[PDB]
Amino acid sequence: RDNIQGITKPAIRRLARRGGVKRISGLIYEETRGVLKVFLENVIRDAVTYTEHAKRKTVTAMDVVYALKRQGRTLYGFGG
Amino acid sequence: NIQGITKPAIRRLARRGGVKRISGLIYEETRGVLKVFLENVIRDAVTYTEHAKRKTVTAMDVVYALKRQGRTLYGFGG
Amino acid sequence: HRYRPGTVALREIRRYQKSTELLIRKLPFQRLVREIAQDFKTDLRFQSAAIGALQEASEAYLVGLFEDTNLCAIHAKRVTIMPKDIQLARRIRGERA
Amino acid sequence: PHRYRPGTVALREIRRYQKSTELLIRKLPFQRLVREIAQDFKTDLRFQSAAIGALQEASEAYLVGLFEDTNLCAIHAKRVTIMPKDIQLARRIRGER
Amino acid sequence: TRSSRAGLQFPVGRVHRLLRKGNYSERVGAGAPVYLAAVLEYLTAEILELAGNAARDNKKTRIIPRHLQLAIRNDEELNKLLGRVTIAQGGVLPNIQAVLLPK
Amino acid sequence: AKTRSSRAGLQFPVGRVHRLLRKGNYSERVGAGAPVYLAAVLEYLTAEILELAGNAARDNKKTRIIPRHLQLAIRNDEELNKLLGRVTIAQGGVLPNIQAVLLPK
Amino acid sequence: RSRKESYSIYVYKVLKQVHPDTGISSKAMGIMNSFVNDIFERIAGEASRLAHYNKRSTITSREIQTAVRLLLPGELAKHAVSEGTKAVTKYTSAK
Amino acid sequence: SRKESYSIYVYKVLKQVHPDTGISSKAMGIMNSFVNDIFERIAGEASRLAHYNKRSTITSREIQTAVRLLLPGELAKHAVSEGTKAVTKYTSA
DNA sequence: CCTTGGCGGTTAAAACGCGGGGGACAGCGCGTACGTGCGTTTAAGCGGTGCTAGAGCTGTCTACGACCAATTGAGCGGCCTCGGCACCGGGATTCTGAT
């Protein structure tokens, strides 16, 4: 449990650098965790809800693609 | 024409938006900010007029344009 | 008597948020729309409802963009805005790349 | 073995992140995070490896775009370092909370 | 109207025909129109439950376009629904900044 | 000839779009000329992508088109990228960009 | 001379049900006649997406039930789905 | 079953455009997912247009108008110029 | 029959200077923490290997909502009376500036 804080700080630092940032502050990681919590919440609710409407308890790859397309995040290379 | 918008109009618009002082070079952009923002919208509308097969633009073509551009308006038949 | 530049400005800020009265007259908006639309095609008849709807939408958009600009300036801890403020305001939304 | 001033290998490291295409985030930690997050919704669930990979890749792309937004806000603010308030301003403009 | 026997003000037939007129699917169950009409009636009920209160707060009874818009933005769920859509003569809720206000 | 696609000099199948429109319930009545037109529309749509994909292929001196090549190709141009503003390529990556402030002082 | 559908008295009736004494001006009716039907269009589009994604050509009452939960927050959608299910059950049990 | 796509249609189009350059089937699925969303958007726009005119079917003029609506001026012009010859040749054969 | 053009005219929507003054913003004094290299640890990274639980697909049913044909009365389109809320002068006051 408590894997929201379990996200490694250097991983968020690498993502921020890949966002083209030269100096990385120590409070960036926690803000990233807080934002990513809700960002994952929205997409997980969408995809699992698509799965639930089809009377399924196991989410496949296609429902993720459908939910992302509805939200405006169509993903290539994984089908869709 | 392009500069038909008056400076005090933009000044009061910035007061409405909550800006106390405006830098010198912002004004020239501000007028332009509307133009393209209108342009794209009417860039749909005239094309909708092509779909409208009418020389007169009804108030529902602008509803189409605002629905597609993301700025749909209610209250006025939208 | 003479007040500081900003007391009347903040009075204007407070009052313009409770008034929906259109600032700029409708004739300049018509001039803009007609002149720009002359490029695409002539014989374009803009009915009153369409003009009013587009005018209100444009004013609401400009007020919201000024609000985002002021928010960015507050983020920059400044009162007077700069061109990069509005540039960032239109940049973050994704309309500008 | 000599040490360089700030900004030498960092930018190179940035290039190492931008040139490369494989998932920089290690798989199992984010996998277990997804497990825990989804387990809070309904217990005793099974989630496909293909789906969790798509979710992780989407999260990586969303994060890198979000730090692009944070960089843009920081540059507009005349700073190099990024701060949480940059993201606070950017998300409200985008409209996601 | 069968909405009278359904305990619903919004007629079922208009919802059913609008679904059929919109060509959203080849077949639609009988529950979909009644359920959709009930959802719309509940949604507008909360629209008017706050709109009436807003009108009554101003020593008023008739509702102006300004009266409805505030109730839209007063909530946070209702604001979430109308997040990126503006309503004519609606405007924005007042908001005063302390940093702009003089010391 | 016999096939509708090859008769009109269009490679993409009209039948696929016609079947989609018919058994997609988008409209009770589905045209035949409109799928013919949309077949050529899709043909030119894919032709443009393959047109800039070939030029992006020799950027890294590679032949197999990979998601990195697609991100290097599609994103640089304007019209498709703006029309695909909410489109991300899986395992593609971002264009190598260095901002103005990226130099230490 | 087409008698198009509108919410001239539907709004008034539901207003009386929620508030015995409250008026609405027609300029607000201009807002409502568009906004209510636009929320209707949002829900209908979500239902169409649900039906098309799960390969369903026949739409039942279950599509909207969770389409609302996708389109609305949980707190707002919970009351909506409860009231809708209750109304459907009452309609079925009645005449 | 028979899962119809443009797997070899895209190959033939590429051979017409750039036969000397290869691709990978992952890019083929990428193009499939691209054209799926594009077709869904086109179908939605054409359905809305036909509804505005209270039309039960979609004709070539509506498709042309939708192409102007969605594609930019250069791209819409290219698509219309390439597609008029399509219907012209389809009429004869 | 709604939509387009065109005069009345005269006060509000601008339309351009004067003083100016807190604020936008380019230089100095000063810190800690992030760049960077490395000690130390490791838990994940990669990959066999069995149990399995409903998804994919198919066998076997089948309920009731879409097509037809008929009845009405809800409600929309419009019309009359007067009124809920917009709007102008007099006090209460309510903000703030300069000292």
Next chain:
DNA sequence: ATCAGAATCCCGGTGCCGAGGCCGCTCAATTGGTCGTAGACAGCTCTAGCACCGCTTAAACGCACGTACGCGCTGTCCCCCGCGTTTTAACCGCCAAGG
């Protein structure tokens, strides 16, 4: 605190043209017959998911050296806002076409 300066706000008083209840028609909502079909339950396969378990390394945490960019002074110079004078034309009320 201790003065003034304008400008809103309620109270009293004034309008008003459509808001709301009601005439009417009328056609769409609603309901009795008919069908068929994809929704629906159940089962075979099965296959990737779950989970365990064995063998392996750049990533994660911290320790430690350095300087410089962010934060706060330090001017610094300043250019649109309130105030002052000046220009003008917009659109309710009118006319016409007109398409």
